[PDB]
Each structure stands twice: as C-alpha cells, then as structure tokens.
Design a protein around this ligand. Structure first.
Ligand SMILES: Nc1nc2c(ncn2[C@@H]2O[C@H](COP(=O)(O)OP(=O)(O)O)[C@@H](O)[C@H]2O)c(=O)[nH]1
Ligand SMILES: [K+]
Ligand SMILES: [Mg+2]
Lengths: 130, 94, 194, 133, 208
C-alpha cells in the first residue's frame, strides 16, 4: 500500500523505482537526487509543510509549521522517509501560542500526534501532546 | 580601589596592601623534561573546536555561508563577431 | 586624585585568560638587594603599577549582562555584570596525555564490511501481545525472564532420547542465558586484548 | 595464469564475500549496481511466492506508540537573551553578492521578525455595525 | 508540460544558471522564477551567465556585467565548441561550488532561461562536444537532459520558459527571439520595430 512500483525502460522491463503514495515532510534544504540513482520518489504535490494543531488547553486550532517527523508508528524506515500517516508523532513550531517554561524560557517546539489520514482528506490534522 | 577623579567613574585608582607570605627563593636544583615529553604534555585535543574550512563562515544569525570567487574576466581577449553591418566597405550613399 | 595611567619604556604584555601581566623592564639589584631599606617599597610600587595596568585591561574587556532572575540555573542574575575573559595565551603542560581512541572492534569492523548501520535505541519497552501491557525487554522485571516464572511449559520432543529430559526447561533456559552472557564477556575480553 | 585467479588476487591485497566481487567491484559496489536489476518477485513452479518484490511486502505491521514522558516535554526552547541577540542581529546583516547560503539556522522567525511600523491597520467596522444594521 | 519540466530541473538542481542574452539581458530576465527560488528554495544557488557577448561591443558587455553583479554573480560568456570565451571561468566557478558541497557526493547545475539564449550551446561548450541539440527555432529542447561534466558535477539542460506578463507586448516577445516568425500573420507590421531597434547605417550595410 505504501509504495507504487514505477516501471522504467522503453519496453517497461525494469521495475526498481518506488513511489511513496502517502504525504511526506522532506525537511529544510531538500534537493532531489539525480534521476539515474533515485530509487525512492517523494513527489512535490504530496509534500507538506504545515499542520492544523489543536491544543487541548483553551480548545484552539492553529496552522503551525512542521519542524520534524519524530516517530511514524508503522516503521522507523517510514520515520526516516518522513511519511505522515495517522498516528505519526511530529515536532511543531509553537511560537505563536506564547508558552513559557518555569525558568522563563520561551517554548517554540513541541510534539503532536497526527489524528487523520492526509492521503484521504488532503490536509494534516494533529493534536498537541500536553 | 578608590575614586580617581581623573579616569572617570569607570577607571579607579588601585593600591596594594601586603598580606604575606613574603618569601625569597634561591634556585637550588633543576630537573627539566625531555622534548618528546614536552610535546606530549602540550598536545591540544582539537576534537572540541570546529574545524577551519576555507571560504566557509558562520554569520551572526547562525547561517552557514560559503564565498565564491569569480576571478578576472578580461573582455579584451574576446573577439566580437565581425558582422557585415559593421564594415565600412559596404557603405551606401557615398 | 593620583593618576591611573602608568608609563613604561617596554610595554607590559598580558594574559587576560589567566589574569597575568608580564613586564620585562630593567630591574636594578641595588634597590632589590637585601642590604637596602627601600626594597619592600620598590617591589610594592612596581607590583602596584603592573596591577593597575592589568585592572585597566580587565575593565576594558567586553562584558556579559543577563535578564534572568535569581533562583534558576546559571549563576548569573540580572543585576550582575560579568567580564568575558579571553582564552589563556600562556601554554602550560597537561597533567595527563590525551585519551587515545579505542581501536575498532571485531564487531565494528564486521559492521563496516557488511553495511550494518547502528540501531536507533528508541527505548527499552516492548508490547507483550498476549497481555495488554508495555513491559521492559530486559533488566529488572524484563520480558526475557518470563519463562522462568511461566506456570506451564511443554517439553520439546527433541529433549527425548537424551539425559537432559528430566531437567526443568526453565533451568535449561537460565543456563543457556548465562552461557550466552559469559560468552559475550569472553568476546569483550578478547577485543580488549586486541 | 594463477596470479589472475580470485584466490591469488585476494591474498596479495570468508563467508562475507558476494557474487560478482572481482578486481573491478567490491561487495558494496556489487549490491549498489544490482539495485538496477533488483525489484522483481520470485515465484516457483506451482506459483507460490518465494520472495516478494523489494518494498512490496504485504505483511501488515502492528503500529503502536508506547507511553513515554518524552512525548510531553518541550523540544526547543529559547532564552530572552538569545531572542534579544537574534532580534538585534537580524537587521545588522549585510548581504554580500558573493556569499551563498549553504545552510539556514533553525529559529523562531515569527518571534524574531517584529518591525516597527509607522501606520496601524484600519479598524473592523463589522464589529460595531453589521450589514443588517 | 514545459513548466513541469522547469520545476523538475529546479527541484533537482543545487546550482541554477540563468542564461541571459547580452543584447537584451533585462528583456530576457525571468524575475518571477528568481523570486520563487529566493522564497521557497533559498539553499539553491542562482547565478547569471551573459551569453552571446560576441554580438555586443566590449564596453556594453562590461557595463552589463557590472550592473548585474550588484545583484547576482554574473559571468560574461561566448558559447562555441571551438572558439569560446569564459569556459575556464565557468568551470572553475562550478569547481568552487562542488568543493563547497563536498558533503554531497555530486551536485547538479540546471540551466534555465528564455528559448534561444544558448543554454544547449553553453552545455556543448563545457563538454567540448555536441551533446545537446542546438537550433535557432524555439522548442528545440523539449525534455530535460542530464550531462556528466565531471564525476561530481552534473549539468541539466531544460526547455526554454517565457514567464507571462501584461506589460510585454507581442512585439516585445517577437524581438526576444521567442516565436517562430513563419507562423505569424502579418510581419510587415513588426518591421517598424526592427527599424526602431536597429541603427540605419548598420541596416544599410547589411542589406546594401
Ligand atoms: N553569436 C552567438 N550565437 C550563439 C551563442 N550561443 C548560442 N548561439 C546561437 O543561438 C541559437 C540558439 O542556441 P541554443 O543553444 O539552441 O539556445 P537554447 O534554446 O537556449 O538551448 C543557436 O543557433 C546558436 O548557434 C553565442 O555565444 N554567440
Ligand atoms: K533553441
Ligand atoms: Mg536548447
């Protein structure tokens, strides 16, 4: 389900390239690998940068940028590929929520859990882990 | 320390008061280390400092930057295309 | 209102990391000999001049200020202003040589040859499916020792035909576990000898 | 030529070696170049799957997230001194045309991009007076 | 199709070379793509190559290099397999980029710009071989093409792009060498633009 076989060659005889069918977070400074050595394909339309995060406190939802993918429960391979499916733990930028630690430090990064299927509804929904 | 009234409020006048002990050492005997032992004792780790890389800098905002160098572009060694409309031999109305 | 500016024919050099000042000027033994009554005053005056120059440099150093309150980690409070000392210039011998690198072990060389990347070490908890609990995979109350406390074990048919038929399977597993651990210790000792 | 044999070549320069490893390719090279012919499934006479195609295994994983107090902590914090430093520095940067950005630092840019503006936005009139009024 | 190819080459390129015509560089600039690169992909390095520098006087090329260098690193160029100018400068600049990205095992340099500005010609010049098809007719390059320059440096040929604008007229598009003249309806109405853009003595010397 996760991968789609991509056939190559004039008569479609080769089948080594794989395309990820789910939504991904590729991180900052992403450059595509050269096409001759590109086995894993993560197309640009399925790449996400921001998520709708709901805070259990005060019951508000904000559109926050994605910092990292922490844990995809399906596999650490999907974690390192950045696959965003239901239940994935992500790191989110919480700067606009105005959180302060007990020591006076400003919180600007926390964890959230993805609660929907972005391949089905076209967006990332997550609940903040507090 | 005291107010100096001549170096402002930022530079005071210093004075000293002896505490002790006052000692007078006469140099009796010496036992110097070997040069290889000296080098071994003065080896620095270098594991903790960032390595120096050419044309790579870290700016005030924390961005890693690289500098490139164009070199000299001497346009006097380029021959422009000798187009027909630049030739006085095809002059009209003369 | 005595001055704070000290004149010297040869400039004093400074090591502000170690808070030291070195002056290499001409010192006359007539005024520093034990037969002189002004030797202590002479030494005090020269030390006073050198300390004055050192203090001028230290107060010319850049300063760090903070805004955090007291009671937190850090040791610098908002009302305090500290000096930023540069790295020490004077080179002094160390008390011990630098830690040499550990040589690559047999396992590490095998992993380099066979392309084995080191594991993630996410945690030590595993899900035991027959129950509904997250339990440690090793250690105190670890899941590697559940067979010793298991209420009932079926005796494997391969144990028939041997003299080990009558022994407790839990005892056999404990002996196998200890054998593996001692073998791991022996391998570590061998890597240490190499 | 006995010196052109594989055994003799190895001694000049046991279970770990792979097929195709020769004078021109080592093991890592062999597996990287076999990537181009890798991705097919294997079936026998009766049609049972000896081996699935790469990245095409159909076993359903048991996808769980364990309870852990690391999920509920802060991951990035920034001090007030660091905020003041970066807020002052953003503005004193002078771009050179011959410097290129190799890597961007990770910062709370919404906190840092705060500029004094001469004018305020217009007020919202729909709060005091609706369309129906 | 063309814009899909362009975004593919940008996504694959560590370095992007914008090829400009030395006769009308501001006319051949793609400002929108420069903006998009500076906004969405700031880690990709964008430079100017001013091609066809043999078609303008020496001081015109020098002044254009000076004014474009205030914005981006600019290199004057004359593309030719046998008799070129700037080949060594461009190659050593790409070597510097590779040494900066020594962490990557290889880098890719994508060539973008207007049609017929000479992107395939520059690639052929760097290779010293006709590896990319060259023609004065627009749309000669239809898909991207990988060319290995060195083991660590790849070059990506791209089809030409024309960013849409409202101020630019069909006359301006035509005089930028973008359209096929054989498919335009009445070219006599565009001839006065030729008379406006060309010197009279130069025209009368060209056509006797
Ligand atoms: N005079 C001159 N003509 C050039 C130069 N570079 C390219 N050309 C010509 O311009 C035309 C278009 O070249 P091409 O490489 O196909 O441009 P592309 O569409 O950007 O790939 C060709 O006929 C080239 O011969 C140059 O430096 N000087
Ligand atoms: K062309
Ligand atoms: Mg072309």
């Amino acid at each position: 389900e996760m991968f789609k076989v991509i056939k190559t060659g004039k008569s479609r005889s080769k089948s080594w390239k794989r395309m990820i069918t789910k939504h991904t977070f590729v991180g900052e400074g992403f450059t595509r690998r050269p096409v001759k050595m590109e086995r894993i394909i993560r197309p640009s339309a399925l790449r996400q940068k921001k998520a709708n995060v709901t805070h259990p406190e005060l019951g508000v939802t904000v559109f926050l940028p994605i910092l990292a993918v922490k844990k995809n429960p399906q596999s650490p391979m999907y974690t390192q590929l950045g696959v965003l499916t239901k239940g994935t733990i992500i790191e989110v930028n919480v700067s606009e929520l105005g959180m302060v630690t007990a020591g006076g430090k400003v919180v600007w990064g926390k964890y959230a859990q993805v609660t929907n299927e972005p391949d089905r509804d076209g967006c990332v929904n997550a609940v903040l882990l507090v | 320390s005291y107010k100096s009234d001549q170096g402002g409020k930022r530079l005071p006048r210093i004075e000293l008061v002896e505490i002790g002990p006052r000692l007078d050492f006469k140099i009796g005997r010496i036992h110097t280390p070997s040069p290889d032992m000296v080098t071994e004792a003065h080896k620095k780790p270098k594991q903790l400092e960032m390595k120096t890389k050419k044309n790579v800098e870290l700016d005030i905002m924390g961005d890693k930057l690289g500098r490139i160098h164009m070199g000299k572009q001497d346009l006097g060694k380029l021959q422009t295309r000798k187009m027909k409309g630049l030739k006085s031999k095809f002059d009209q109305g003369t | 209102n005595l001055p704070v500016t000290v004149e010297k024919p040869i400039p004093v050099v400074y090591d502000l990391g170690n808070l030291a000042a070195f002056d290499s000027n001409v010192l006359d033994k007539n005024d520093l000999d034990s037969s002189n009554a002004r030797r202590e005053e002479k030494i005090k005056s020269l030390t006073r001049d050198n300390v004055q120059l050192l203090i001028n440099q230290l107060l010319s150093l850049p300063m760090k200020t903070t805004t955090e309150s007291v009671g937190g980690t850090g040791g610098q409070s908002s009302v305090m202003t500290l000096l930023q000392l540069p790295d020490p210039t004077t080179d002094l011998p160390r008390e011990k040589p630098l830690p040499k690198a550990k040589a690559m072990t047999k396992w590490e060389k095998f992993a380099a040859k066979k392309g084995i990347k080191p594991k993630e070490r996410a945690g030590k908890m595993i899900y035991d499916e027959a129950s509904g609990e997250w339990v440690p995979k090793w250690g105190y109350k670890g899941a590697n020792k559940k067979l010793d406390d298991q209420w009932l074990v079926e005796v494997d048919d391969k144990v028939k035909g041997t003299d080990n038929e009558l022994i407790d399977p839990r005892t056999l597993n404990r002996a196998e576990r200890k054998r593996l651990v001692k073998k791991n210790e022996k391998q570590q000792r061998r890597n240490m000898k190499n | 030529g006995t010196g052109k044999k594989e055994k003799s070549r190895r001694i000049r320069e046991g279970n770990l070696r792979v097929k195709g490893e020769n004078f021109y390719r080592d093991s890592k090279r062999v597996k990287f170049l076999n990537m181009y012919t890798s991705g097919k499934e294997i079936r026998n006479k009766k049609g049972n799957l000896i081996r699935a195609a790469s990245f095409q295994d159909s076993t359903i994983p048991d996808a769980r997230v364990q309870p852990d107090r690391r999920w509920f902590g802060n991951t990035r914090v920034i001090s007030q001194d660091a905020l003041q430093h970066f807020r002052s520095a953003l503005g004193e940067t002078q771009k050179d045309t011959y410097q290129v950005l190799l890597r961007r630092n990770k910062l709370p840019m919404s906190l840092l991009e705060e500029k004094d503006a001469d004018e305020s936005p217009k007020a919202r009139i729909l709060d005091t007076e609706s369309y129906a009024d | 199709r063309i814009w899909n190819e362009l975004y593919k080459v940008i996504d694959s390129s560590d370095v992007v070379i914008h090829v400009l015509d030395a006769r009308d560089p501001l006319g051949t600039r793609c400002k929108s793509v420069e903006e998009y690169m500076k906004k969405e992909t700031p880690h990709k390095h964008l430079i100017y190559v001013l091609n066809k520098c043999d078609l303008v006087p020496t001081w015109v090329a020098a002044a254009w290099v000076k004014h474009l260098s205030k914005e981006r690193p600019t290199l004057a160029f004359h593309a030719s397999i046998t008799n070129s100018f700037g080949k060594g400068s461009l190659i050593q600049l790409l070597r510097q980029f590779s040494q900066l990205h020594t962490d990557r095992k290889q880098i890719s340099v994508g060539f973008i710009g207007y049609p017929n500005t000479g992107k395939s010609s520059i690639i052929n010049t760097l290779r010293k071989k006709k590896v990319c098809q060259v023609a004065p007719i627009p749309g000669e390059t239809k898909v991207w093409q990988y060319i290995t320059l060195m083991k660590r440096i790849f070059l990506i040929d791209c089809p030409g792009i024309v960013p849409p604008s409202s101020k630019d007229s069909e006359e301006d598009i035509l005089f930028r060498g973008v359209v096929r003249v054989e498919h335009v309806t009445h070219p006599e109405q565009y001839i006065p633009g030729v008379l406006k853009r060309c010197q009279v003595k130069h025209l009368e010397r060209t056509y006797e």
